């Protein structure tokens, strides 16, 4: 019942609250489900500069209750802290949502055929060639031509 600690508008209590969460978030994944409305207070707060990290904990609760595309929306505005983590499983699940959203947008862009372009976030297209640098550095040529067929 630490949810009541979020009522205070003073920032230094929030970093100690999330310091508790992200460590035990594995066991408390069920507890974060009721923190939705009170996380948005921090995410929409202008004086709260951790909204990049607050978008991650907002993606964990929605992933717990069955929401996916909404977590991908928060992944956009999550800044560089979201795309800097390549570790374990969480990297391959987000790129499966992001690159599929990227490759279905590029096919849509080729149907314009020119002009009246849809908005393309620099973060979703930015990790394309960024993670593609991991290919040429790994020297494996077989999938180096594969990304070009993906994005078309």
């Amino acid at each position: 019942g630490i949810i009541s600690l979020l009522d205070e508008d003073e920032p230094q209590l929030k970093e100690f609250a999330l310091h508790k969460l992200n460590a035990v978030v594995n066991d408390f994944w069920a507890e974060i489900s009721e923190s939705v409305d009170k996380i948005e207070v921090l995410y929409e707060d202008e004086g709260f500069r951790s909204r990049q990290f607050a978008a991650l904990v907002a993606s964990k609760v929605f992933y717990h209750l069955g929401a996916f595309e909404e977590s991908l929306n928060y992944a956009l505005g999550a800044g560089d802290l979201f795309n800097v983590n390549d570790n374990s499983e969480y990297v391959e699940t987000i790129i499966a949502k992001c690159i599929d959203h990227y490759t279905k947008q590029c096919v849509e862009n080729a149907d314009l055929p020119e002009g009246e372009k849809k908005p393309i976030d620099q973060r979703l297209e930015g990790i394309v060639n960024k993670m593609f640098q991991r290919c040429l550095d790994d020297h494996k040529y077989k999938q180096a031509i594969g990304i070009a067929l993906e994005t078309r």
């Binding site: 077989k142 999938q143 594969g146 067929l149 993906e150």
Partner: protein, 55 residues
């Protein structure tokens, strides 16, 4: 190369996915055609008839 076949393998996946409505729509038609064939054999011979003794 593994993404190549990964883009190859969903073809026959989706090719058999459209093969689902292939048979399902075909078999129900033919089913109604077989039910129409039930009216055929029941139509024959209709009238008239003649009595006979089974041996």
């Amino acid at each position: 190369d593994l993404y190549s076949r990964y883009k190859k393998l969903q073809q026959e996946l989706e090719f058999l996915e459209v093969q689902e409505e292939y048979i399902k729509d075909e078999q129900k038609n033919l089913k109604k055609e077989f039910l129409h064939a039930q009216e055929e054999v029941k139509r024959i011979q209709s009238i008239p008839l003649v009595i006979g003794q089974f041996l």
